[PDB]
Write a protein that binds this ligand. Structure first.
Ligand SMILES: [Mg+2]
Ligand SMILES: [Zn+2]
Ligand SMILES: [Zn+2]
Lengths: 28, 48, 76, 129, 105, 49, 543, 76, 75
């Protein structure tokens, strides 16, 4: 399931905007 | 007349050239059939 | 022979009138390379330039058939 | 189902104009075996081939001698060498090669192989250099 | 060309015996006198420079792409004429939009 | 990597052999074949068995 | 294409006799049409049971998926049961809009998820902000549909028979006629002038193939059986002598009187019905008995009416597709014969095979339209056709309910196929080969394809601006033709780059490039201009 | 045909112990000399039999092995 | 030429092939063209003009001479 979502590009977009806001740690 | 169920699917591909129906037996003057040169070294045929 | 009127009946290019008698209409290039060819001079030069590229590609394949036929006739 | 990558088709268009009762015996016909030949060595005074080794024949002599020096080790060179190629080459040049050149000129229908055996030590040596 | 007066069909010629007698598929015959005896003909260097280019010559003064020369038109005295080259004979014709045709063509 | 027809023709023109033997047999699909010499047909030979 | 062109009227004749009504009935007419079709943006099943979340192009490229948009179809099915004694039972069903297909979506098109997205959104979605798109994402690779260079439709192409093989022929004139826009199916007619003097007209379309008809036979099929009228239609005048009309008249006479081996029974016949029957018998399939059907008047009438409808739809469709336009079709055909015979006189030279005035460039839309119509036929209609045949095998015809009809229609498109429109469209995109076999039939793929080699953005843009002639079956033989089609032509300047070409090997001059300012037009409003021309007082109509 | 048994497998062959690379100019090489990269020289090998006359010469090749050039990795 | 040409190179390992390669197929035998009976090789481009410049009488500076150190450097 994760491999279907983690390779989904909008998750990278959703992740990179959470990193900017600092909602998630910068690394993985 | 109005059926397309066994429409000949070859006529769907409209003709592209003029004499497509003529079988021609003269070999292509650009083929490398009788020239035994490898595909990777085809750059050796390049001009300069 | 000079450039043939292939654009239309009596025309060599869209840049020249029908049945033009000037030598430039039939491929006579007046400029030199260092001077810089004009647009129709370059087109005529490209017709000669491509026609040399076609001859090369024919040369490799045409001689390949003759070379193999000649080898087998003579190899023994 | 579009398959594509067809195996084509191949066409040949030419003609090869290659210009007592009898029954089936098994000994008159057949005989795939060829009759054993007898070797006729042309006398040394009747040989009409070149007394100088061709570059082909000299190269063959050197190659054969070098291979045999690769399997054996015996030679007649006073000056020792580290390579069989050098030993064979100098053996040819010094005229002490233990090989003979048999030049075959005939196959007689009577089962007769006519040859000229040439001694490389008495023959001229080509350039090879 | 002979067409049947009743069937409107092309009739064979049927040269029998001392005369020419056309025959239709309907069996009608009309025969032929004098001017029907031309079986075949061929004229060399004819049918060229009259019928092949008549439309082209007529439209040439109106063609923008035709070459033009500085020469007075006898009829309308226009300073320019339309120059035309036709055939392997390279016949030069000067035509004008006024209908002047150089009497050649 | 291929030694096509033309390479063989060139080596033959040079009268090579041996190099042709080496490349075409030793460094290629060189096998050893057995013929009966009596019927001319391929035969079965084995030294181990 | 789906609505106007994909209409089905197929009749089956069973042998099932398990009920009195089953014995009384040996016929069934399957008839259906679609009026709904729409391609929506690509979807992906996130966990095999989701709500088909959006599929972005980078997900397709990374995971090897196909960036294809699903195809939603709705069809109206009419089933008619035919019995003896003239009875006719009809079952009608309307199918809800169903989806079993996906169509590949070109990146950047209005059905692509990045059609109007911002450049920054494209940047963070994994796409190229500066690239324009124009390619397809299929099975882990990016594919570009090139500009296939095609000859001009509705144009008479006349070329001398300079092939030096099978020279029993003299000059040939082909005319590919298209009923309208790009997507209407074209019917090609070939006019051959023969050494024996005959002038044979061959029509190649759906219903016709490799069948050569004498010209006068086609002319008098539509009435006008008088030879005078035919000669007047060709030469335009039998009363002005001239030197050109004399030659055309004499050679048309020679063609009229030539005995062809195949059409001997109806060659001399002046009866329109007999000729229509003969051609229908020869050209229509599924009629194996040539004598059994003749004793039934209604079978004769059916064959004649079907043949007349076919000839209405196949002979010069651009001239019209109605019976009232048949005489003007005869006028146009006479004009074509007149042009060919003028060219024979050396009065006109043959058509330039390489001049770009008589050439068109078909890209993405047209090539995919043709490939899609063929593939949709094979992988949609035939599944449905066989499913309905088996359904009639399983169940009595009046016993069929509304729900069963839809089950057999939708299920037939599902089993063992399940994607084949998408898979076959992908195969056409990937291959682009000028010889493919679909359902074991040697057809040609007119889709100019090319793998997207991203060496640089210049390479990508040049690839998307590339015009390929793409030699088909019966390619260039050893002649001047292989040289002339590679030369820079005098019509190239301004539209085809005079300089750009492959500098090596077979591809020298084979692949052309659009000039910097050249553009490819779409189909215009032909109807408005035609109406304005007809309303113009300066133009006198054919009538 | 060219890809057939005769023209592809009999009249020609795929061979081992062969290398291919781009050529380039070296004015410091004799006309009868070719510049062979050391990566290719360590890949292709020359079969030298061991005898009394060459055992001294082949010892440095044998001792080096794969570790140093000139070396060798195969012994029959 | 060196515009991207690729040429095959295989090193003989058999003694018969190695003996053959140096004795028979060495390039010294192809110096004279079998086709034309003339030489195949010579000076090309950089050296054909280099031989002319070396052997010409007068340079634009003056007489074409060099001192001992630069005459030695030519060798
Ligand atoms: Mg090169
Ligand atoms: Zn009549
Ligand atoms: Zn005037």
């Amino acid at each position: 399931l994760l491999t279907e979502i983690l390779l989904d590009p909008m998750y990278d977009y959703a992740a990179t905007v959470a990193r900017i806001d600092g909602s998630i740690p910068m690394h993985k | 007349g109005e059926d397309s169920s066994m429409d000949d699917i070859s006529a769907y591909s409209s003709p592209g050239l003029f004499g497509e129906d003529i079988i021609d037996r003269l070999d292509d003057p650009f083929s490398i059939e009788d020239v035994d040169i490898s595909l990777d070294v085809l750059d050796n045929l390049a001009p300069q | 022979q000079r450039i043939q009127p292939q654009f239309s009946f009596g025309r060599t290019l869209v840049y020249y009138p029908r049945f033009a008698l000037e030598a430039q209409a039939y491929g006579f290039i007046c400029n030199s390379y260092i001077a810089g060819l004009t647009s129709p001079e370059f087109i005529f030069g490209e017709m000669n330039g491509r026609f040399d590229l076609i001859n090369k590609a024919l040369s490799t394949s045409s001689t390949g058939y003759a070379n193999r036929k000649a080898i087998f006739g003579l190899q023994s | 189902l579009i398959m594509d990558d067809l195996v084509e088709e191949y066409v040949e268009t030419e003609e090869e104009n290659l210009v007592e009762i009898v029954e089936s015996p098994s000994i008159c016909e057949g005989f795939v075996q060829a009759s054993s030949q007898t070797l006729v060595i042309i006398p040394d005074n009747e040989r009409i081939t070149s007394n100088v080794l061709t570059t082909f024949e000299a190269t063959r002599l050197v190659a054969v001698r070098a291979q045999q020096l690769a399997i054996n080790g015996s030679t007649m060179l006073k000056k020792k060498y580290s390579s069989p190629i050098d030993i064979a080459k100098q053996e040819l040049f010094n005229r002490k090669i233990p090989l003979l050149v048999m030049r075959c000129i005939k196959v007689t229908p009577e089962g007769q192989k006519i040859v000229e055996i040439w001694n490389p030590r008495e023959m001229g040596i080509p350039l090879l250099d | 060309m002979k067409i049947c007066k009743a069937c409107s069909s092309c009739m064979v010629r049927t040269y029998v015996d001392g005369n020419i007698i056309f025959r239709c598929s309907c069996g009608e015959s009309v025969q032929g006198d004098s001017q029907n005896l031309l079986v075949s003909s061929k004229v060399y260097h004819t049918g060229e420079m009259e019928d092949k280019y008549k439309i082209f010559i007529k439209n040439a003064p109106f063609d923008p792409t035709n070459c033009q020369i500085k020469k007075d038109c006898p009829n309308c005295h226009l300073d320019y004429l339309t120059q035309i080259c036709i055939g392997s004979q390279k016949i030069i014709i000067l035509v004008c939009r006024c209908g002047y045709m150089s009497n050649r063509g | 990597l291929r030694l096509g027809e033309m390479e063989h023709w060139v080596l033959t023109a040079q009268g090579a052999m041996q190099t042709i033997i080496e490349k075409s047999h030793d460094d290629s699909d060189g096998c050893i074949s057995y013929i009966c010499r009596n019927c001319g047909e391929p035969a079965i030979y084995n030294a181990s068995h | 294409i789906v609505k106007q062109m994909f209409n089905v009227d197929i009749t089956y004749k069973d042998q099932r006799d398990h009920t009195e009504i089953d014995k009384l009935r040996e016929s069934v007419q399957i008839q259906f049409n679609f009026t709904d079709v729409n391609i929506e943006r690509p979807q992906h099943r996130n966990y095999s049971q989701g709500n088909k979340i959006n599929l972005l192009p980078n997900k397709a490229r990374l995971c090897g998926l196909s960036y294809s948009g699903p195809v939603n179809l709705a069809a109206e099915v009419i089933l008619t049961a035919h019995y003896s004694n003239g009875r006719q039972e009809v079952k009608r069903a309307s199918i809800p809009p169903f989806q079993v297909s996906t169509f590949p979506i070109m990146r950047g098109s209005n059905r692509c998820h990045t059609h109007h997205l911002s450049k920054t959104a494209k940047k963070e979605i994994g796409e190229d902000p500066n690239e324009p798109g124009g390619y397809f994402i299929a099975r882990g690779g990016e594919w570009v549909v090139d500009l296939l260079e095609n000859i001009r439709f509705n144009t008479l192409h006349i070329h001398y028979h300079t092939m030096q093989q099978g020279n029993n022929e003299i000059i040939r004139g082909e005319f590919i006629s298209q009923p309208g826009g790009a997507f209407e199916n074209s019917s090609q007619i070939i006019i051959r002038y023969m050494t024996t003097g005959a002038i044979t007209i061959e029509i190649n379309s759906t219903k016709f193939s490799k069948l050569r008809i004498p010209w006068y036979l086609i002319f008098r099929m539509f009435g006008m059986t008088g030879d005078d009228s035919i000669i007047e239609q060709v030469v335009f005048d039998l009363e002005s002598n001239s030197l050109v009309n004399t030659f055309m008249i004499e050679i048309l006479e020679k063609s009229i009187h030539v005995l062809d081996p195949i059409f001997q029974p109806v060659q001399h016949e002046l009866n329109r019905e007999k000729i229509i029957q003969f051609l229908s018998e020869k050209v229509s399939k599924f009629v194996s008995n040539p004598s059994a059907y003749k004793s039934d008047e209604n079978a004769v009438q059916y064959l004649n009416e079907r043949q007349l409808t076919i000839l209405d739809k196949i002979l010069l469709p651009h001239m019209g597709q109605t019976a009232d336009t048949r005489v003007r079709k005869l006028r146009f055909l006479g004009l074509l014969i007149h042009k060919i015979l003028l060219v024979i006189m050396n009065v006109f030279p043959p058509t330039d095979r390489d001049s770009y005035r008589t050439k068109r460039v078909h890209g993405s839309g047209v090539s995919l339209a043709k490939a899609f119509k063929a593939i949709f036929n094979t992988s949609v209609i035939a599944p449905i056709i066989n499913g309905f045949k088996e359904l009639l095998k399983q169940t009595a015809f009046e016993e069929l309910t509304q729900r069963n009809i839809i089950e057999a229609f939708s299920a037939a498109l599902s089993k063992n196929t399940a994607s084949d429109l998408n898979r076959s469209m992908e195969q056409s995109i990937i291959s682009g080969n000028k010889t493919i076999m679909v359902r074991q039939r040697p057809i040609v793929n007119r889709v100019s394809t090319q793998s997207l080699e991203r060496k640089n953005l210049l390479n990508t843009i040049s690839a998307l601006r590339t015009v390929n002639t793409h030699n088909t079956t019966n390619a260039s033989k050893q002649t001047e033709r292989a040289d002339m089609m590679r030369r820079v032509h005098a019509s190239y300047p301004g539209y085809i780059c005079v300089a750009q070409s492959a500098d090596t090997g077979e591809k020298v001059g084979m692949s052309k490039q659009l000039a910097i300012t050249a553009n490819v037009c779409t189909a215009g409003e032909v109807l408005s201009l035609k109406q304005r021309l007809l309303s113009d007082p300066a133009i006198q109509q054919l009538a | 045909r060219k890809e057939g048994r005769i023209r592809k497998s009999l009249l020609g062959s795929q061979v081992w112990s062969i290398s291919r690379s781009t050529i380039c100019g070296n004015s410091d090489l004799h006309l009868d000399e070719v510049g062979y990269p050391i990566s290719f020289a360590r890949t292709l090998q020359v079969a030298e039999t061991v005898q009394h006359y060459n055992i001294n010469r082949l010892m440095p090749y044998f001792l080096n092995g794969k570790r140093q050039y000139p070396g060798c990795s195969r012994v029959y | 030429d060196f515009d991207g040409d690729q040429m095959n190179l295989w090193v003989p390992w058999s003694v018969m092939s190695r003996v053959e390669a140096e004795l028979l197929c060495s390039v010294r035998n192809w110096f004279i063209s079998t086709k034309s009976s003339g030489p195949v090789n010579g000076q090309v481009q950089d050296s054909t003009v280099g031989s002319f410049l070396l052997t010409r009488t007068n340079t634009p500076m003056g007489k074409n001479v060099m001192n001992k150190l630069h005459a030695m450097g030519l060798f």
